Amino acid sequence: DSVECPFCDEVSKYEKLAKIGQGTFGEVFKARHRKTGQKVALKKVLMENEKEGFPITALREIKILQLLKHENVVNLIEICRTKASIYLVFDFCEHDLAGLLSNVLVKFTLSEIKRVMQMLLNGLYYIHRNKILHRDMKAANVLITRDGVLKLADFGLARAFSLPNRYTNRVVTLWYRPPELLLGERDYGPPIDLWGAGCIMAEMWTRSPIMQGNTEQHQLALISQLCGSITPEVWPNVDNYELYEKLELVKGQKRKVKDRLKAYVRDPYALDLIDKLLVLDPAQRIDSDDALNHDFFWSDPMPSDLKG
Amino acid sequence: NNKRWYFTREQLENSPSRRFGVDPDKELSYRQQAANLLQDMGQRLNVSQLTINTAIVYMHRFYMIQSFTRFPGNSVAPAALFLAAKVEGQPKKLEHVIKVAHTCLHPQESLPDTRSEAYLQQVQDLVILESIILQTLGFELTIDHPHTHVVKCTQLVRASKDLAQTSYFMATNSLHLTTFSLQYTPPVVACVCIHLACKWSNWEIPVSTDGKHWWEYVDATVTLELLDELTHELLQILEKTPNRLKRIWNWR
Ligand SMILES: CNc1nc(C)c(-c2nc(Nc3cccc(N4CCCN(C(C)=O)CC4)c3)ncc2C#N)s1
DSSP: OOOOOTTSOBGGGEEEEEEEEOTTTOOEEEEEETTTOOEEEEEEOOOSOOTTSSOHHHHHHHHHHHHOOOTTBOOEEEEEBOOOOOEEEEEOOSEEHHHHHTOTTOOOOHHHHHHHHHHHHHHHHHHHHTTEEOOOOOGGGEEEOTTSOEEEOOOTTOEEOOOOOOOOSSOSOGGGOOHHHHTTOSSOOTHHHHHHHHHHHHHHHHSSOSOOOSSHHHHHHHHHHHHOOOOTTTSTTGGGOHHHHTTOOOSSOOBOHHHHHTTTOOOHHHHHHHHHHSOSSTTTSOOHHHHHHSGGGSSSSOOOOOOO | OOSTTOOOHHHHHTOTTGGGTOOHHHHHHHHHHHHHHHHHHHHHTTOOHHHHHHHHHHHHHHTTTSOTTTSOHHHHHHHHHHHHHHHTTOOOOHHHHHHHHHHHHOSSSOOOOTTSHHHHHHHHHHHHHHHHHHHHTTTOOOOOOHHHHHHHHHHTTTOOHHHHHHHHHHHHHHHHHOSGGGTSOHHHHHHHHHHHHHHHHTOOOOOOTTSOOGGGGTOTTOOHHHHHHHHHHHHHHHHHSTTTGGGGOOOO
16 A cells, blocks of 8 residues: 555666566566666566465575675676566676577687686686575576676575585486486585586587486486496495485496597697586585686686677 | 664654654564564574564564554564564464464464455465565565674683673663664674673673773774663663563572
């Protein structure tokens, strides 16, 4: 019945230009601030229910977006209501890595690919340093601005972590999901995001998701056909996983990461870094800090700004 | 801003509620009583003191923008608590919260049929109110409470279990009993609590070798002038609160 509301503006201040989010991701609109022309992205908060008022899942994301302020993380400007529903308002990003890569016209130099990976890994370093797991690392959640600044996007499945945790296992798109999760691990950390950065790095040359399973078992098979097979020798203690005896995967596979990608990726350093990202044991998997230090970012051609 | 939810004394006199004819003193009661409802429900719902405190702050801030004359604390408190439990990761089910609030406010009445029209309305009302809270707070739900800072401070001055427990007590009573959360940052308030706990226990923290007092290690702004002024205020209202002081009173 018309209440005071100083700190929650009506989304009508923005003028919708176009849906860009259909299917899964939710309803996402491009919009224009009615006074200044400032372009933004609007994500509505879906109320399929809740039986339970404002979705605890949306509260979590809002909490996390408000915490994360960094050049390589998407920026939540504000939350808006409606003359009942709710919209997250973000700075607009012109491109999306999945689109760029699935576009034959679009072409990357080795130098720019270096830059992309640098920004991405730097974003990861920041979010992890801030006790957040992104949990949905995939090309389609990586945005790039008209000015060549990469932003990690979609924190809708993200979650704070700490230091026996019982986090949720049903996380990360299947093609990007790390071994740990597929084997049923619930005490995982930042390494899951880095596995995803690996899959994306490889995707910068292959122009396509390297490992496209249909089920968890199919995914684990594909992973084995690339990274060798899951061995307590390779992955110390991979033993105590329930689903380990029960996995019925391969046994003779040996690491083909550098051989199978040898084709697409010219550069030796590139291949070495990818290899260290797609490591099976989460604890032996390179972290963003070391990855940033990797010679791939410190040899010629040195990383360059984006324009292709 | 970082000034958004902190107010001058003058701002506190001109609360939305004053503009609708509610006395200052009456308004403080309205707060106090809501905080009590929050404490009561929170304990029955088995949520943490942290979550109760988060709901209490939400409540404080909500009423710097809304009036008790339009939104009665018996309406806001349950909604505020429902929200705080979600936010603090001790989600409690909506029906459960409605139920507990009902017994709290109407011990003698009897819960309606969860199939009834009357009940369905009050389920909807709470959800609506949670929404008016979110909107009033502009979705800013991450609260910092003095307590984190209490522990930090009482360790870095080697206080007995007792002193530390009393300081935490003060901290919680500051939320129920004062509008300090609307005026002073959590770390400043924490200094006030440790101050009073000391004064109450006859404990004195000796000056550091440098000549620096304990509180300087915790907040650059803090002055003994301010500490004495604030502890005085907090102790006054404590004295007015039947039985509260008994809980920390040395009876030996
Ligand atoms: C997780 N989904 C997303 N939510 C938001 C709010 C996103 C966002 N998007 C942009 N710009 C932008 C530009 C071009 C494409 C997209 N895509 C469309 C194609 C790719 N896509 C999928 C699932 O493959 C979904 C979205 C988005 N700018 C800012 C934000 C933010 N925040 S993306």
